[PDB]
Design a protein around this ligand. Sequence first.
Ligand SMILES: [Cu+2]
Ligand SMILES: [Cu+2]
Ligand SMILES: [Cu+2]
Ligand SMILES: [Cu+2]
Ligand SMILES: [Cu+2]
Ligand SMILES: [Cu+2]
Ligand SMILES: [K+]
Ligand SMILES: [K+]
Lengths: 422, 422
Amino acid sequence: HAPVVFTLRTGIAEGRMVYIGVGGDIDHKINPTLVVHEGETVQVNLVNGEGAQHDVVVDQYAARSAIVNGKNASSTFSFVASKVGEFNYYCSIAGHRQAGMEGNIQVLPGNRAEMKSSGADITRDPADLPGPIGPRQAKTVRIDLETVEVKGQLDDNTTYTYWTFNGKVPGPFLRVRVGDTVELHLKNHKDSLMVHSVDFHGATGPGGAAAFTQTDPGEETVVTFKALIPGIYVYHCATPSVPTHITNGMYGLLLVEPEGGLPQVDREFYVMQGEIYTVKSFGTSGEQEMDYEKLINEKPEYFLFNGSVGSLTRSHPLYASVGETVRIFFGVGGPNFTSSFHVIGEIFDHVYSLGSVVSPPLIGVQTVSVPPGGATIVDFKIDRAGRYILVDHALSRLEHGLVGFLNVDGPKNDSIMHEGPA
Amino acid sequence: HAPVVFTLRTGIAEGRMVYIGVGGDIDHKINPTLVVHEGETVQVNLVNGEGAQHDVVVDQYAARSAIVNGKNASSTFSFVASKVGEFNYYCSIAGHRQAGMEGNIQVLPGNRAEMKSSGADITRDPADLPGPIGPRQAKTVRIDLETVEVKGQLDDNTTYTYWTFNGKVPGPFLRVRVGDTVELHLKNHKDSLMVHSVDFHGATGPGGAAAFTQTDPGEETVVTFKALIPGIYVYHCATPSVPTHITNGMYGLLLVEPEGGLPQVDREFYVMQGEIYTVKSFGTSGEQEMDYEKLINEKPEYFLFNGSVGSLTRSHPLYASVGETVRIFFGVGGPNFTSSFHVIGEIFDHVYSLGSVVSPPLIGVQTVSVPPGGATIVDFKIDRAGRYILVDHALSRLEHGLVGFLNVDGPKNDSIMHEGPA
Ligand SMILES: [Cu+2]
Ligand SMILES: [Cu+2]
Ligand SMILES: [Cu+2]
Ligand SMILES: [Cu+2]
Ligand SMILES: [Cu+2]
Ligand SMILES: [Cu+2]
Ligand SMILES: [K+]
Ligand SMILES: [K+]
């Protein structure tokens, strides 16, 4: 899947010079055992804790970090765990392994267990959206939203109180045609602590409907509005604190299609990016809580596609076939960060700049900047097989949970790309 | 002389696990060279700084500390530096010597250089007192005292602002007879910042004379008083802050002889103990300053015989001959600590309890408690040769500067004490 990441700081613990695990299953453990599965790419982050000179060397794998001299100095490295077995990792600096700097890597056969937690699955499946609208004239379309607060799985062994539309993140993908009148019914579940509401960027008028949809727990609110302008629009809860309702999960997409629909495509996907601001650092397991200082000061701990870590890699990856033309509806709930959306190994044939559906799309684009509260549409033909990788190209975000897979079967080598010379 | 003491704390410095010097000529130096002279007793104090397991081993002397496990854990040890040359000291814990824990001891030939500093010598020679008074009739005795503030030598390469009677610590030994009338002329030097005065414990009347002797810089004060009761009395400055004037050096002894005089003795000595409360720890060099918090909370850094570190060891030890009956007039200026006065290798034949010169002295006593603002007289016959050692037997004080020598020349072995069986 994605690399398994372990973080080690050096220091003095239990009477010796040692490595100490940070986060995951190794948190605060001295010389922790790093357990890994055959064929995984293993990444190790070494951070210098006390200021002596260190490295990490993996015995038999020829893998090592750079040497790290001062306090905080850091070195990151990886290796493919291709041989089952036990392998020491140790510091090669004179005396250090003897002083105590040594632990084990266990390469186990088989595949890593699925992620588990005591929380609900809150992920939107990227194939979970309505298809192109049929050959219909304009009508009144009824849409139902329900606002629900739920303990959700954020990561392996890690949970969070999400606030959602209809129990998943992003909310339901709404699809209407320009000229439609939308009759929106918003129920706020009676267990909710908060009032919830909705602001559609595709709606015209007070709060984009928020003025009409502030709904108490157990109540229902109804609003009707005309869809006047085609485009791909974000919607989100708009009860103060708005950035808090958004970071907790309350965002979704609304497509107002042009009269004759968007160009036809073999397959469509639904993806949104957001942030979560937890008291504890990324990778720390257990029950997570919002940290308001991190929220207001724009210091995220998690960056997420569709609600959770591994949402689009392990739980609900994207799948297509070679020769298919694919469309991604991509939006940023945020609340704060502009995404530099890229599919590793592919090129966008068409990009609907700033989510404009009326203007001609741009042609042949690697990466598209998408602001919080903004959406685009990207289309591309898949020419050949591979695992394509959805990322925000601010690539430090990879290591905060932001990565998605698009799986396409077929041969490794072909005329489009192959090993060896031409 | 006394042992030469080196303190080493363990830590991470300059990128390695090392020893770091504390105080003396080695302060903050990584793996300091400990320079020593042939025949010196070398004491090494090891304090664990960071919490890894440590010792110190001295390579060819086979002297070592105990192992020290947690932060602050300490071990102290010594060896006689009997061979000239260069010797490694190192940590024997696996990996630590390679990690950086090693330095040198240089044993040099010859004798350690004399103590020096930019300060004046403020020490009172312990032979510097008037001898027994005649068989006179009572009379009027004129005493002159001058109060001077002077930068004095506190230790090798270390200085302090002393406040003194007549430029030394303790002030002059005053010696009169019961029935005498003392006419005191107290001059306060014109460069003094402070007013100074004097309170005599052998004086009867307001402030022990202090009400008559508050003396401005540049001025003189004169007071006449009767000496009504024989005894050995402390006197000291009595200007607020009194414990401040006392700690800075303003204390002395006044002997009021009984009518018949004290028992005749071959030799008499003058010794007083006091404390100094410096901002930096004992053993740190440079210009020292008074720390008021340490003074008022009774946390001394220096404990001193006659003014200074090495006053009665290197500067002017006591000297006597075998078979002499010797008398020490011993007083405690303080300001705060009770002394447990003891001469190692000898026994007090007579102790004048609480400074009483009228009651029969106690017989055959090892150690005498002498409160601050109190004095005694001890007499003993010196039966054989040796270096006798004046101590406050609260023996941690040895390391805060409190030690004197009484040097008696002659054969090491005799019928009173000798090596080997009887
Ligand atoms: Cu190391
Ligand atoms: Cu809400
Ligand atoms: Cu908005
Ligand atoms: Cu050590
Ligand atoms: Cu004074
Ligand atoms: Cu007094
Ligand atoms: K393509
Ligand atoms: K004796």
